[PDB]
Design a protein around this nucleic acid. Sequence first.
RNA 1: GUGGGAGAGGGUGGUGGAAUUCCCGGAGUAGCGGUGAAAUGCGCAGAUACCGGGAGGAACGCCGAUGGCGAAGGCAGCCACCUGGUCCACCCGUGACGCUGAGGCGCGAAAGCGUGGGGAGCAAACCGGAUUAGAUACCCGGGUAGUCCACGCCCUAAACGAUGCGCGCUAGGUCUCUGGGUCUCCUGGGGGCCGAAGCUAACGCGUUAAGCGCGCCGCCUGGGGAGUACGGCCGCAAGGC
Lengths: 70, 87, 116, 101
Amino acid sequence: KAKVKATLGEFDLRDYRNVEVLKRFLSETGKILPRRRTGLSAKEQRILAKTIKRARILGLLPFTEKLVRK
Amino acid sequence: PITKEEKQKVIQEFARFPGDTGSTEVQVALLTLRINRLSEHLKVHKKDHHSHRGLLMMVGQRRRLLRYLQREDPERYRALIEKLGIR
Amino acid sequence: KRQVASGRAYIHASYNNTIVTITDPDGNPITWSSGGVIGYKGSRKGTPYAAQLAALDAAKKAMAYGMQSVDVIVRGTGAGREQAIRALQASGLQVKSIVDDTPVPHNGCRPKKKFR
Amino acid sequence: MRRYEVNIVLNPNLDQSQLALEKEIIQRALENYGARVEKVEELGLRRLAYPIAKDPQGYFLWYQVEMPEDRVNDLARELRIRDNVRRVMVVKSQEPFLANA
RNA sequence: GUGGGAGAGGGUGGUGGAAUUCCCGGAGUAGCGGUGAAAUGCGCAGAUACCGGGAGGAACGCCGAUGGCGAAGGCAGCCACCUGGUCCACCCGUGACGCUGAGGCGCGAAAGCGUGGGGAGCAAACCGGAUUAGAUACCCGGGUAGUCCACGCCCUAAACGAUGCGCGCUAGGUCUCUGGGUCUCCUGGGGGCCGAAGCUAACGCGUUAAGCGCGCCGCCUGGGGAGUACGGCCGCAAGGC
Ligand SMILES: [Mg+2]
Ligand SMILES: [Mg+2]
Ligand SMILES: [Mg+2]
Ligand SMILES: [Mg+2]
Ligand SMILES: [Mg+2]
Ligand SMILES: [Mg+2]
Ligand SMILES: [Mg+2]
Ligand SMILES: [Mg+2]
Ligand SMILES: [Mg+2]
Ligand SMILES: [Mg+2]
Ligand SMILES: [Mg+2]
Ligand SMILES: [Mg+2]
Ligand SMILES: [Mg+2]
Ligand SMILES: [Mg+2]
Ligand SMILES: [Mg+2]
Ligand SMILES: [Mg+2]
Ligand SMILES: [Mg+2]
Ligand SMILES: [Mg+2]
Ligand SMILES: [Mg+2]
Ligand SMILES: [Mg+2]
Ligand SMILES: [Mg+2]
Ligand SMILES: [Mg+2]
Ligand SMILES: [Mg+2]
Ligand SMILES: [Mg+2]
Ligand SMILES: [Mg+2]
Ligand SMILES: [Mg+2]
Ligand SMILES: [Mg+2]
Ligand SMILES: [Mg+2]
Ligand SMILES: [Mg+2]
Ligand SMILES: [Mg+2]
Ligand SMILES: [Mg+2]
Ligand SMILES: [Mg+2]
Ligand SMILES: [Mg+2]
Ligand SMILES: [Mg+2]
Ligand SMILES: [Mg+2]
Ligand SMILES: [Mg+2]
Ligand SMILES: [Mg+2]
Ligand SMILES: [Mg+2]
Ligand SMILES: [Mg+2]
Ligand SMILES: [Mg+2]
Ligand SMILES: [Mg+2]
Ligand SMILES: [Mg+2]
Ligand SMILES: [Mg+2]
C-alpha cells in the first residue's frame, strides 16, 4: 500500500515520450492515479496529467484497459 | 507578441535621457505601442471580449498619463503626440 | 455440429434482465441465454436466480457444441452479475479468466432524466 | 522562431524505399516551412498502447526544431497530409522539470 | 523597468479516445426493453447480447480537490497560434501622475426572436402505455421546436457571499493554492475553517469584518392594491427599464 514517486528514479515529469516511467502512474484500468497514491504535489500532479494525456494521444499509453479478476 | 528588443527599441527612442525606463514619455509610448498591437488583434477576433476589456483599461491609463503630462509640460506633451500620432 | 471447445463467455447484466453469450475465441457467438429465455417474464428476469439459470442454460448449450475452457467478459452491474459468474463457475465449464469490460463513456451523451 | 519537438508516427509495414521516401518528404516539408532542425531521435518500432489505423504498432521519430511561430500550424497540416503518416504532434519545447529529482 | 512564475481568463484554426445513435458485414435465436408490477413499444423482413468496418453529431472519464483563473455572466480532452489580467523578487526609472464615478459606452447564464446551416443523445408542446377515485401531473414508450455552429437582436435571474469599489488600523490558531528566502520556519499574494478585541435583534461576522475609521457611487422609508395602471424610452416580437 505505498506510494509511486517514493520508489522510482529521479525523473522527467515533462516527458511525453517516456513510457517506461509513466506507465507507473496509471491504474490497471487506463486511469491516472489520484495523488493519494502517486505521492505527488499539486503542481507535480498537474504536470503529470498533461504529460500522460499527450503521451496517450501518441499511442504510448492507454486511454483504457480492462479489469482482471472481479 | 511584444518582445525584449522590440520593447527596448521603443525605450531607446523615448527615454528622456540615458537609462530612463520609467518616465511619462516611456510609459505613454510603450503603452501606446502595446494598445496598437492589441487593437490590431481585436480587429480580427472581434468576438474576443475579455481582451477588449483589457484594452479599455490600457487606453484609460494612457489618457491618464497623457492628461498629466499635458498638465505639467505642454511642450513635451505636444512632443509626445507629434511623435506618436494620437489625440 | 461445430467443434469449438475453448472460448469467450460474455455476461451482460442490467437492473432489468441478465443475458449470457458464449462465443468462439474470435468472438462470433455460438449460443446464448437470458432471463426470458429460461422461464421468467417480468421484473422476475432481473433476479440473481434467473442470472443463474441463464448462465447455466448457456453453458449446457456450449457443452452441446463441445465447449470446455472459457474466458469470461463481464459487462454491466446489477442483481446477479455475480450470479452468472458463480453459476458459470461450477457450471462444469472451467473458467480461464474473468474480466470486467463495462463500457463507460469518457463523458459524451446526455443521459435521460431518470439518470441525472 | 521558437523551439519545438515535432513527433511523427508512421505505419511500420513499409519497405526501405518507402520509409526513406516518406522521411525525405517530411524533410522537404520541414525545410520548406522555415524550420531549422537541431536534433533527431528516431525510435522506430514501439508496440502501441491501443490500435491506431488498425495497427498494433507504430514507427516513431522525433525532431527538435526552431521555426517561425507563425508557420507551425501549416507545417503541421502538410506533415499530416501524407496517408502513411499515422499521427503527428508538434509541441513547443519546455525545459526539463523533474520532481523527486 | 528588469528578471522570474501559476492558472478550465479570452479568440481562432487542428486533432484524440470512450460512449450513444444509425448504416454495411459476420456469426447467432426468441425475445428484448421497461416497471412498484405492468403495458404501450421494438422483434422471424432476424431484433437483443457478440465480433469487425463505416457515417455523423455532441460532450470531454480518470487527473479533479473541501483546487485554479476571471470584473461579472462564466471557464475543464490534447496541440498550435493570437491575446487579457495578475503575483513575486531586485529598489532601477517617473514623481502625486491618486480614489470614486451620476450620464454615457461595453460585457452580460439560461430561455426567447431573425436569417442561414446542422441535428447523434436529450427533449417543452404534442401522440400513445399501466397507476387505478383519476391524468389528461409524478412512472413507461415515441416525439417537434430547442439544445449545437455563423452573423444579428433580446438585457432578464436566488446575475448570491442575498454582503458596491479604494485605502489605513485592530490577537492568534489551523488546512491549503502559488511566489521569494539564508527553507525547526519566515516573508508576499489567493482560497477555507475556528477564534482576541469589537460588533450584532438574534443568527452570526471577526486582518477574505458584518470591528475601528475616511472618500466616493447605488439604494431604503408598513402590508394588500402592484412591479399593476398611465406616460415615456428601448425591442422584429416576446418583453424589458
Ligand atoms: Mg425486466
Ligand atoms: Mg515582467
Ligand atoms: Mg484556458
Ligand atoms: Mg481557450
Ligand atoms: Mg447485424
Ligand atoms: Mg409478446
Ligand atoms: Mg408486431
Ligand atoms: Mg412490422
Ligand atoms: Mg460497432
Ligand atoms: Mg445523419
Ligand atoms: Mg470528480
Ligand atoms: Mg456562480
Ligand atoms: Mg500572459
Ligand atoms: Mg528610487
Ligand atoms: Mg528623483
Ligand atoms: Mg473606476
Ligand atoms: Mg442614477
Ligand atoms: Mg455606469
Ligand atoms: Mg443573454
Ligand atoms: Mg442561449
Ligand atoms: Mg415561439
Ligand atoms: Mg435561432
Ligand atoms: Mg434554425
Ligand atoms: Mg418523455
Ligand atoms: Mg391513466
Ligand atoms: Mg426517447
Ligand atoms: Mg450562492
Ligand atoms: Mg454584487
Ligand atoms: Mg487565515
Ligand atoms: Mg509560501
Ligand atoms: Mg519555496
Ligand atoms: Mg493567507
Ligand atoms: Mg468565525
Ligand atoms: Mg465577544
Ligand atoms: Mg453565538
Ligand atoms: Mg475592510
Ligand atoms: Mg452589519
Ligand atoms: Mg400603502
Ligand atoms: Mg416585469
Ligand atoms: Mg401617469
Ligand atoms: Mg407602457
Ligand atoms: Mg415601436
Ligand atoms: Mg416576462
